[PDB]
Every structure is written in structure tokens, then in C-alpha cells.
């Protein structure tokens, strides 16, 4: 009960959504105290969840102050089976390394400029990512349609062969040169066509190999921007909060 509003764990007028960002992926024992929607609310991290414990905890009240109730469980805490360990400190003062309103304001304008430019590049990359992913899907469907087409034209050669074998046998024995030439001319036209369909599939397979490579490169570029964009927003938002606190408040 040494201090009052000086305490590092007290945050005051901050929403549950803000506390959820502060406790995200934190170890069991992480905690912070804030003002209730009314009276205060202690939020404790336990088993991957944030636990809301109201401060009025049980009816026989042995706590004299908010700092006395916290420090009692901070040192030694089942009556469940969890003791208050690492408190979220007001660390956030270090993010803004400027003295006056003018210098902070100048740095916020810089960060916001960088953030909007990086946001615009991220959205452009995301549209390219989507478009590339969609076109890769189309080329994969078109290759399957080519495979099926080539199978049918091959079946056609086989069918031409089965049905002409005995007729070419007879025409050669009957001396009809014009009739054999007409058969092999059609077969040539069929083979010429299967060659053209095969080359078209081959070209599409190349374009897909190239677009699949572009995709991996777009994915890599986005996996690089994402963390840098998040950090930039965090900085920007921290400088904005600094200016709100330093400036005339309602």
C-alpha cells in the first residue's frame, strides 16, 4: 500500500479490447488493473485466457487500498492456484523519445507518412497476391482440360488405327493408291492437331511455372511488410497517445 496512482500496473480509463492486446500471447501470471464500466477490474492471464476479477474480492474485505489488495497476491495465492507475477508497466514511455510537443508532433507526422505509404504498398501487394492466386487456379483448371482433350485425340488415333488396318490391307492388294493416301492424309491432319494441342499445354505449363514463382515472391514480400507495418502503426499510435496526454485535456 506504499503508492496510489503511481503504481505501474494501474491503467485507468482503458477498454477491455486494449487490455486484450496487452495480454495477448502472455505467460500465466501477467496482470493489470483498470477502472470498471460503473469500483475497479483486475485482469489476470491464466491458461491462455484473460480472467476478469472485480474489486469491490470475497465479502469479508481485508484490503485497505487497491495497491494493498494487489501486493498481497503479487508476493504469495489460491484463496484459483495462480499468483500475480509480471505487471504491464505504463516501457510505453520509452517508445516516444522526444521532449516537447513540437518535436513529438514532427515525429508523428513522419511516422504517419511512412505508415500510409507502407499501408498503400501492402494493399497493392495484396491485390497482386489475390489476382496471381486466382490466375494460378484458372491455369490449373485449363491444364486439366488440356490433359482430357489430349487423351481424346490420342483415343482417336487408336480408333483410326483399329478401323483402317484391315482396309489399308485390302486397298494395297486391290491397288488403290488414291484411297490409302486419303486415309494417311486424314491421320496426318489428326497427328498435326495433337502436336498443336500438346504445344499449347506445354506453353501453359511454362506460364504457370512462371506465375507460381511470382506468387511465392509476392508472398515473401508480404511476409516482410506485415511485421514492419504492425510495428509502424504501434509507434504512430504511441506518439498520438503521447500528444493527447501532453496537450490540454477535457
Amino acid at each position: 500500500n506504499m503508492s496510489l496512482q503511481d503504481a505501474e500496473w494501474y491503467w485507468g480509463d482503458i477498454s477491455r479490447e486494449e487490455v486484450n492486446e496487452k495480454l495477448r500471447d502472455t505467460a500465466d501470471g501477467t496482470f493489470l488493473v483498470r477502472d470498471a464500466s460503473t469500483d475497479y477490474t483486475l485482469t489476470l492471464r491464466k491458461g491462455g485466457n484473460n480472467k476478469l476479477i472485480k474489486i469491490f474480492f470475497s465479502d469479508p474485505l481485508t484490503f485497505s487500498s487497491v495497491v494493498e489488495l494487489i501486493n498481497h497476491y503479487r508476493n504469495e495465492l489460491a484463496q484459483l492456484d495462480v499468483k500475480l507475477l509480471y505487471p504491464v508497466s505504463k516501457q510505453q514511455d520509452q517508445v516516444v523519445k522526444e521532449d516537447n510537443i513540437e518535436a513529438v508532433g514532427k515525429k508523428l507526422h513522419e511516422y504517419n507518412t511512412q505508415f500510409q505509404e507502407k499501408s498503400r504498398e501492402y494493399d497493392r501487394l495484396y491485390e497482386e497476391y489475390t489476382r496471381t492466386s486466382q490466375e494460378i487456379q484458372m491455369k490449373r483448371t485449363a491444364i486439366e482440360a488440356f490433359n482430357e482433350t489430349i487423351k481424346i485425340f490420342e483415343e482417336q488415333c487408336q480408333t483410326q488405327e483399329r478401323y483402317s488396318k484391315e482396309y489399308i490391307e485390302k486397298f494395297k492388294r486391290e491397288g488403290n493408291e488414291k484411297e490409302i493416301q486419303r486415309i494417311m492424309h486424314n491421320y496426318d491432319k489428326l497427328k498435326s492437331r495433337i502436336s498443336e494441342i500438346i504445344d499449347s499445354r506445354r506453353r501453359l505449363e511454362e506460364d504457370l511455372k512462371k506465375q507460381a514463382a511470382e506468387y511465392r515472391e509476392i508472398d515473401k514480400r508480404m511476409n516482410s511488410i506485415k511485421p514492419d507495418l504492425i510495428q509502424l502503426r504501434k509507434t504512430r499510435d504511441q506518439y498520438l497517445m503521447w500528444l493527447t496526454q501532453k496537450g490540454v485535456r477535457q
Binding site: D25, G48, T141, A145, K189
Partner: protein, 1017 residues
């Protein structure tokens, strides 16, 4: 696979007028035949078989009538063309060819499977291929719902057929609001009954006056009496005994009064009373309709005829552990990130059952771990709906001590399968891309199961082996374990907890309280969602006890049971209870009103076969109005690989049993494919061409017989009671906006179209995501309904909007409307808007225009503020000539500016300009001091508090839409915005003070309250 485009060939949107077709004869010969792009297959076959005589081995060819054509489609399917009346341009061919074959197998099954496959946008044969026994079980087992539905349809034929095709468009309750009843002349309505006195089809009107609660037959009886003849009282009574041979129809559309409901309970009539408009009905013979209704026949498909030790989970004495082996690859820049690891969690809904466990960090180039991960959960303590949620994350530890963690790919797996077997052995899981905007390392809201695209990061896993197959215990075993597990100011506390919103904070003290009083809770059954969140789901002792309470739990209102179907309630008993409530109490009216949310929560279901899908399919197959929207909402998501298998299998079972509606739906689908293709040509090949050149191309292609055949004579997908007749091409235009939407106009072919609307105007838009508008418009309809039922006549007039696919849909055009910018252009001054409305509404009708403007303006003022709609301006707000305000293109809702700008404030999208204030104040100098403005403020205050009282419904509706994939609706923290705008953590009086300050800040003063400061009186 699904068709890449809506074009006539692969890489060719439109075929040239004449095209060369490679024809493969059954003798092995190839013939190149030039065909007209729109020639039918019967013509091509005849032209081919004539030509084939000039080619070798012609003697081996049978009569042309012995053969049909077969070819590869844009879906990579070998389709048999049994319908030779179809045109070459409509065959969806991959390449220009046709193979001649002798038709074999079951002709009937093949034709039906093609029709279903066309509707669904996916070949049926693709399902027969699927190796998963859960899919094959779904396909066979769902057929009992199909057979039930079709048998209920022939129960009382033909009335039961008519009731399916034309269900009554009725409200949920016959009771009318006082202000609606007072619009009547001592409980009586004046109705106009029309008779088509055949032949020559001559119209006669009967201005009839009857009681609002008159059943349709009672209305028919009065029309019989009031008919022009001469007969006495006893003669008019015996002629009335020969009635019940007639039915009532709405003039101008396909709405029928087939059921015995009060006339006022019919939405058309209720709307008529409200608007003060005269109801125009058409009397027709029962036989005229019953003869037009065909008998629907369901056929058992071919796949139905063919076929595709155990330890309890509770006897397994160990903790949970999963081995993460390796990942094939990750797409990362090795110079930008330091290490990669696998993040895992055990979830029940979006709540972890224990702390998250990570693997060790490893290099980008070498994604290998071979690490058993240990979870703080006893294997018997695993709830039935438990899931493994994982991701491969990247770590960038370059700036100070600060680390940057980002997910690269994610995946979710049900720890128990559809047969209650616990996962065992080795498992390969294909991972999914991270959704845009998602920053969390795990995605527990995301779908479960492997990514169907196998050209993605594949994570190799290993589950424990227990020398046998582990099954989750049966209910009998669960029930016995619950028995082994075993002043009144606290009764008031439970009442306060039950009234709170679904996303209000619940303390650990409240959880322990709710759990301690779980048996009294049964007195307040609506406390169930709050109580279920109090349960420790990581403890089989508590769950077993919760299952016992749920089994005997009293039913709750459907609007409350709907919450138990969202992503926070995954337990099959909880979801089962929720479904049983909807079966008993959910009306067709409300089912149609919340269908979109009910379809999205299907995505949350762990398995294909469940009580919800069976309930929805039964209803879609019992009511065509539901069936229509059930089909279109499922079809609109068929491009989405996360849900395409589930939605495709569902759609297959729907199309197999919907009867004749499949033919009407295929007509809608082909009209849409041609609109998609037309818009694709304009956006791609013709994008650098002028509006005049684009319009010449448009009028030329729309005039093609194949285009005129597909886009005339079909039902409107926005409302199937609306018949789209002949296209009025002189009214059809391309809009000057970026996405170049089509503004289309059709004739209404209804014999009495002039009494409803002679023209049907619809906008077709390709390029924009229409789901946000679709959701916004639906919320506006629910808000207006709350308002009307509470006595507030704040007319919104929300236009129809339907998403039909990936950034493609239909938007209903609001008749006789003009943007504020259009009015401002015709004039410059701030009085220009009020001047326009004076010129449009002269003398006597002036007051009704200002009133309508004020009422609609207040509705929009409150709705846009609560929702956080996209900013309003003179180009997205319109006014009808009667005064009715209509807001268009909402696009974004909730905190859509949260990331972009760090500012934390609730926006006022709709700030009433001096121009709007001048209208409300009837041209006064000081606008905010008028009695008109004071009355307008009172309307806003009433509208706002009315929505705040119904907050749980709106929060539930947004919670059910988290599955959708809308960027502004990804987490419950996104829904937190309406908790702020509705000031749910404040008192009713503080909330009104809050709304007033928001309006005061945006309008720079003028907003007052007649009520006192201390107590609002």
C-alpha cells in the same frame, strides 16, 4: 474443377460469328466444319454427317440419329450433349471440337446430374471421386431429408404443391400495432378485387370494404356478394356456398393468399395499411393455378445403391501431446526474418482449453522440428468439440529486445472425427493463407480440415497411439459421471446477468455464481448462453453436468437460440438444443429474415452431417421462398475453397429434391453467366474503348438470339415473385463509374403489372464486394421492423441487394429517385433541396412530403450512427419525388477507420447539412429552434433507444457473420463498435445523453431534450 471464366471458349470470351470445329468421327476420321457460333447441335450433327460422306471409311458410320456429341468443358469434364437443341456458344467448351459417340448408360441420371452441376457451378462427378468417407456418408445419409420433404409436398396435393411453390408472405404475428390499426376505418380495410373476365381478358374492379382480420375466403365471399347482376339476400347466400373454387393473388407479381391467415397478416396488406395505399388484388380460379403446378418427383441417385479393440476416451490415463514433425516449405525472405516456429493451441470455440504451446525456433530454409508438444490437459478432460489450432509463425528480433511475430500459414483440425474417434498416428495437413487483416498468430474462427490446394505449405504431424481405436464416451456413460460429480437478492442478480448483451464482461465471481446456481437458472432459461460460458470445458465433471441440464432445459426464443449456433458455442448438445428451438418456434418469416446468418453458421459446424444442415435443407425443400435464397447464398460462396466442398454437397442434395424450381434456377444462372461474360469483355479487352464504342458493342451483343433467349423470361434472383419478361433495350445502359455496372430494365409480364410496376429495373455489378451492403440493408429492415412494431413510422425503403458470387451481384434500382448532387446541379443555394421538393409536391400534398423526408432522415440518422456506415455525401444519398430518403452504397461498417488512423472516436457518417435542416424546418431562418426539428430529434431519440433495447439481436447477427470473410467483421472486437454506439455499458439515460453529445459535436450544437437533467422527465 470450377470454370475459370464465363466465356464461350478457354481464353475467348465471345466466339466469332463463324468458327472452325474439329469433329472426331467414330471411324477415327477428323473433319473440320465451319459452324455459326449460335448454331444448334442438331444442325452441326446433320451438317457433319453430310460432309462425312466426302471422307474415307464413311461406310462404317451409322445413321446420324444413333449418335450424340461429347466434348471437354471449361470445367475439365467430358460432357455428353443429350440436349441437341443447345447452341455451340452455350456449351462452355474448352476448345473448338466435338467427338461423335453412341450414347450409353443411364440417360436420365446423366441429364439430371448435368442440370444439377450447371446450377451448382461444379460437376457432380467430382463428388463421386472424393476419397473421404465423411463426404460419401453425407451424400447418402442426407437423402432421407430429401425424401421426407418431397413426400410432405405430395401429402395434400395440389394445395401442398401450391403451398411449397407459393408460400404465404405473412408476418410472424396477427396482432397489429395501435398506430397501424388506427389507420383503419373502425377495424375495416377498403380492398380492390379484380376479375379477368375471360375470353378477350377484360378487367373489372370491385371497391370492397371488409374487416382487416378477414381470412382470404371471407374476402372471396364478399366479392361474390358485391358482383354486378339482380338477386335477393337468400339468392346471394346460396351462390356464396359454391365458393372455395377461387384464390387471391397480388396484382403485378406472383404473391398468393393460399393460407387462412387474417388479411392484415399478409405482408402486402400490412404494408398497404401502413402506407395508406389501396390494396389491389386479383381473383382467380383455384384450378387455373393447380393445373400450372407440376408434380415433383425425387429419384434415389446411383451413389445411394452402391457402397464406399475400442477404448473409451475416459479410460486413457495420460496428458495430451502432439508431435510436430516438419513443414515442406514457407515463403519468407531469409534476409528479413530470423526464425520460424509452429504455434499450437487446444480450443473449444475461440476459447483455449489450456495455454498455447510453441515448438522450438528453427531456420527458414529448414522447417523441421520433430518435437512432441505437451499440453496442460488430461486426455479424459477433452470436450467433444475440442480442436487443434495451429500456424507456422515467423520471428523478426532486429529492433532492441522487441520481437515481431507474424503467421505465415494456418490450419485447424477436429481432435475427434464425425464417428467420435480421437485422432491417432501420422497426419499431413495443407495449410491456408492468412486472411487479410488478421494479425493474431492462430486463427481458431477459421475452417477446419486440410487445404484442398496441395501446392501449399504441408505440415506433417503425429498423434498418440494407445494400442487401439479411442472413441469419445456415449451419453449413458456421460450421464452416470454427472451423478458422481454431484437470500433472494441473488435471484435478482441472475435476472440482471440474463439481460446483459452477449459480449458484456463476465467476472470469475459471476462465473462461479452462475455455476453455483445452475439449478435455479432453469427458472430464467434465457440465462443459458451466460451459464455455458461459466462452464469449465476443460473438465469432464462440469461438462457431464452441463449436458444433463441442457437435455431437460426449457426452450428459448429463436432470436436467443441463434446465439448458441455461433462460433462461441461448438458443443453438439448446445447446438442440438438451439436447433430444436428453431424447429419448434422459428417462423418462415424470421427464417427468411435471418437465412444469411443461418447459412454462415453452417461453416462453424465441425462436420458435414449435423442437426442444423438437416433443419435448413428441410425448410428450403418445404418453402420455395427459402429455397431460392438458400440456393443463392450457397452458390455465391462456391468460389471459396474453405467452404466449396460443404456448400457443393449441400447444393447437390438441394437441387436433387427441389423439383421444377431447378429449371427456373438454371435460367437464372445462365442469365447471370451471360451478364458476367458481357461485363468481363468491357473490363478487360474493351477497357481502353469509349462509352459510345462500348454501348454500340453492348446493343449489338444484347440483340443476339442466344443473349435474348437467356435474358428474357426468367425470375428475378432479388425476388422470385417478380417475373423478368422482355428486355427494354432502349433503357439498358453501362454506368460511367469505375466498375462499369449495367443498368438493366425488363417489362413486368404480369397481366396486371400497371397496378404494381410496369418495369423492373436492376443493376448488375461485377467488381465490387456486395456482402457489406447486403448485411447493412438486412439490418436496416430489422431496425425498421422494430420501429414499426413500437409505433415509430420511420420509413427506410431498403432496396434489394444480392451477392451472386465473387464480387458480383444484383442491386435493385429505387424507382423515381435522385441523388442530392442531381438536385443541386439543376439549381447552388442551400434552399435548392427544399425548392425541388416544393416543385414536386404542390399545395395539399406538401406536408406529407416534408413528414416523409423527416421520418426517413431520422431512421438513417440513427441507423448510420449505430452501424458506422461509410461516410455520407450528396452522391450516396437520394430523395424520391414523394420525399422518401434512400441511402445507397454503404460499403463499410463498424470501426473500418480503426487501423488507418489512430483516433478513437465514434463517427457520425450522416451529418445533416443546412440544406436538410431547411427541408425539415419548412424553409425557416433558425432551423434548430422549430417545432419540426424538436419533433425530428424526438424521433431519433425514440429510434435509438428502441434499437438499444434490441441490442442482443444485432450483436448476435454480427456474431453469426464472423465466418463470412468480410474484412470489417473478423473478431468479436470488431463487434465492440456497436457496444460503444449503443452505449451498452451505460444506463439508458446516460446512453441518450451519449447519443445527444455525438449529434451535438457533429452538428455544432442545436440538439436538446425536453426531459430534465437529473431524471429524464
Amino acid at each position: 474443377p470450377p470454370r475459370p471464366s464465363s466465356g464461350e471458349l478457354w481464353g475467348i470470351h465471345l466466339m466469332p460469328p463463324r468458327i472452325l470445329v474439329e469433329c472426331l468421327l467414330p471411324n477415327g476420321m477428323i473433319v473440320t466444319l465451319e459452324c455459326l457460333r449460335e448454331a444448334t447441335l442438331i444442325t452441326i450433327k446433320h451438317e457433319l454427317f453430310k460432309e462425312a460422306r466426302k471422307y474415307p471409311l464413311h461406310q462404317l458410320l451409322q445413321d446420324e440419329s444413333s449418335y450424340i456429341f461429347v466434348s471437354v468443358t471449361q470445367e475439365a469434364e467430358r460432357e455428353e450433349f443429350f440436349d441437341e437443341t443447345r447452341r455451340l456458344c452455350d456449351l462452355r467448351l474448352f476448345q473448338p471440337f466435338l467427338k461423335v459417340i453412341e450414347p450409353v448408360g443411364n440417360r436420365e441420371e446423366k441429364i439430371l446430374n448435368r442440370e444439377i452441376g450447371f446450377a451448382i457451378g461444379m460437376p457432380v462427378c467430382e463428388f463421386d471421386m472424393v476419397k473421404d468417407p465423411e463426404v460419401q456418408d453425407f451424400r447418402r445419409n442426407i437423402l432421407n431429408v430429401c425424401k421426407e420433404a418431397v413426400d410432405l409436398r405430395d401429402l395434400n396435393s395440389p394445395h401442398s404443391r401450391a403451398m411449397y411453390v407459393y408460400p404465404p408472405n405473412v408476418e410472424s404475428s396477427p396482432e397489429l400495432p395501435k398506430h397501424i390499426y388506427n389507420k383503419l376505418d373502425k377495424g375495416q380495410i377498403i380492398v380492390v378485387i379484380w376479375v379477368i373476365v375471360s375470353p378477350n381478358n377484360d378487367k373489372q374492379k370491385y371497391t370492397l370494404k371488409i374487416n382487416h382480420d378477414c381470412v382470404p375466403e371471407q374476402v372471396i365471399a364478399e366479392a361474390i356478394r358485391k358482383k354486378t347482376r339482380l338477386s335477393s339476400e337468400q339468392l346471394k347466400l346460396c351462390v356464396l356456398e359454391y365458393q372455395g373454387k377461387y384464390i387471391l393473388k397480388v396484382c403485378g407479381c406472383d404473391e398468393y393468399f393460399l393460407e387462412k391467415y387474417p388479411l392484415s397478416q399478409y405482408k402486402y396488406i400490412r404494408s398497404c395499411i401502413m402506407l395508406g395505399r389501396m390494396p389491389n388484388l386479383m381473383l382467380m380460379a383455384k384450378e387455373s393455378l393447380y393445373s400450372q403446378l407440376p408434380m415433383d418427383c425425387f429419384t434415389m441417385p446411383s451413389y445411394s445403391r452402391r457402397i464406399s479393440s475400442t477404448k473409451s476416451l475416459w479410460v486413457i490415463n495420460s496428458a495430451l501431446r502432439i508431435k510436430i514433425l516438419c513443414a515442406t516449405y514457407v515463403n519468407v525472405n531469409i534476409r528479413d526474418i530470423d526464425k520460424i516456429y509452429v504455434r499450437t493451441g487446444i480450443y473449444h470455440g475461440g476459447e483455449p482449453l489450456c495455454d498455447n504451446v510453441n515448438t522450438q525456433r528453427v531456420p527458414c530454409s529448414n522447417p523441421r522440428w520433430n518435437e512432441w508438444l505437451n499440453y496442460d490437459i488430461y486426455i479424459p478432460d477433452l470436450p467433444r468439440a475440442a480442436r487443434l489450432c495451429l500456424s507456422i509463425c515467423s520471428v523478426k528480433g532486429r529492433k532492441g529486445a522487441k520481437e515481431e511475430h507474424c503467421p505465415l500459414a494456418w490450419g485447424n483440425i477436429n481432435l475427434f472425427d464425425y464417428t467420435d474417434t480421437l485422432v491417432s498416428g501420422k497426419m499431413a495437413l495443407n495449410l491456408w493463407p492468412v486472411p487479410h487483416g488478421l494479425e493474431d498468430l492462430l486463427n481458431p474462427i477459421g475452417v477446419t480440415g486440410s487445404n484442398p490446394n496441395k501446392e501449399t505449405p504441408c505440415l506433417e504431424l503425429e498423434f498418440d497411439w494407445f494400442s487401439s481405436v479411442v472413441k469419445f464416451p456415449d451419453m449413458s456413460v456421460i450421464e452416470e459421471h454427472a451423478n458422481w460429480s454431484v437470500r433472494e437478492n441473488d435471484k435478482e442478480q441472475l435476472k440482471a446477468i440474463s439481460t446483459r448483451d452477449p459480449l458484456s464482461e463476465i467476472t470469475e465471481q459471476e462465473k462461479d455464481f452462475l455455476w453455483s446456481h445452475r439449478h435455479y437458472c432453469v427458472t430464467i432459461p434465457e440465462i443459458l448462453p451466460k451459464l455455458l460460458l461459466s462452464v469449465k470445458w476443460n473438465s469432464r465433471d462440469e461438462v457431464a453436468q452441463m449436458y444433463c441440464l441442457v437435455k431437460d432445459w426449457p426452450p428459448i426464443k429463436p432470436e436467443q437460440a441463434m446465439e448458441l449456433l455461433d462460433c462461441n458455442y461448438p458443443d453438439p448438445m448446445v447446438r442440438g438444443f438451439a436447433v430444436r428451438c428453431l424447429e419448434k418456434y422459428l417462423t418462415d418469416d424470421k427464417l427468411s429474415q435471418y437465412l444469411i446468418q443461418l447459412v454462415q453458421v453452417l461453416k462453424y459446424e465441425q462436420y458435414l452431417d449435423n442437426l442444423l444442415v438437416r433443419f435448413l435443407l428441410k425448410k428450403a425443400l418445404t418453402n420455395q421462398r427459402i429455397g431460392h435464397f438458400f440456393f443463392w447464398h450457397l452458390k455465391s460462396e462456391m468460389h471459396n475453397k474453405t467452404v466449396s466442398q460443404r456448400f457443393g454437397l449441400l447444393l447437390e442434395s438441394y437441387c436433387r429434391a427441389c423439383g421444377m424450381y431447378l429449371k427456373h434456377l438454371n435460367r437464372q444462372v445462365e442469365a447471370m453467366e451471360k451478364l458476367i461474360n458481357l461485363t468481363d469483355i468491357l473490363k478487360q479487352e474493351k477497357k481502353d474503348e469509349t462509352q459510345k464504342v462500348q454501348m454500340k458493342f453492348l446493343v449489338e451483343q444484347m440483340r443476339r438470339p442466344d443473349f435474348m433467349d437467356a435474358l428474357q423470361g426468367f425470375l428475378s434472383p432479388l425476388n422470385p415473385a417478380h417475373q423478368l419478361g422482355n428486355l427494354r433495350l432502349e433503357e439498358c445502359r453501362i454506368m460511367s463509374s469505375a466498375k462499369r455496372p449495367l443498368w438493366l430494365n425488363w417489362e413486368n409480364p404480369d397481366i396486371m403489372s400497371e397496378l404494381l410496376f410496369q418495369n423492373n429495373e436492376i443493376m448488375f455489378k461485377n467488381g465490387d464486394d456486395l456482402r457489406q451492403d447486403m448485411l447493412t440493408l438486412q439490418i436496416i429492415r430489422i431496425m425498421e421492423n422494430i420501429w414499426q412494431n413500437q409505433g415509430l413510422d420511420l420509413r427506410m425503403l431498403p432496396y434489394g441487394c444480392l451477392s451472386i458470387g465473387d464480387c458480383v451481384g444484383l442491386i435493385e434500382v429505387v424507382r423515381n429517385s435522385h441523388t442530392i448532387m442531381q438536385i443541386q446541379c439543376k439549381g447552388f443555394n442551400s434552399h435548392t433541396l427544399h425548392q425541388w421538393l416544393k416543385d414536386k409536391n404542390k399545395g395539399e400534398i406538401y406536408d406529407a412530403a416534408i413528414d416523409l423526408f423527416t421520418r426517413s432522415c431520422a431512421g438513417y440518422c440513427v441507423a448510420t450512427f449505430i452501424l458506422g456506415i461509410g461516410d455520407r455525401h450528396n452522391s450516396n444519398i437520394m430523395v424520391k419525388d414523394d420525399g422518401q430518403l434512400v441511402h445507397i452504397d454503404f460499403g463499410h461498417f463498424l470501426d473500418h477507420k480503426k487501423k488507418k488512423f489512430g483516433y478513437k472516436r465514434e463517427r457520425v457518417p450522416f451529418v445533416l447539412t443546412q440544406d436538410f435542416l431547411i427541408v425539415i424546418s419548412k424553409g425557416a431562418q433558425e432551423c434548430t429552434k422549430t417545432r419540426e426539428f424538436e419533433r425530428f430529434q424526438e424521433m431519433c431519440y425514440k429510434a435509438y433507444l428502441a434499437i438499444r433495447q434490441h441490442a442482443n439481436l444485432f450483436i448476435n447477427l454480427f456474431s453469426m457473420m464472423l465466418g463470412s470473410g468480410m474484412p470489417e467483421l473478423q473478431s468479436f472486437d470488431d463487434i465492440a463498435y456497436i457496444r460503444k454506439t449503443l452505449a451498452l455499458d451505460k444506463t439508458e439515460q446516460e446512453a441518450l445523453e451519449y447519443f445527444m453529445k455525438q449529434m451535438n459535436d457533429a452538428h455544432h450544437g442545436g440538439w436538446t431534450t425536453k426531459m430534465d437533467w437529473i431524471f429524464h422527465t
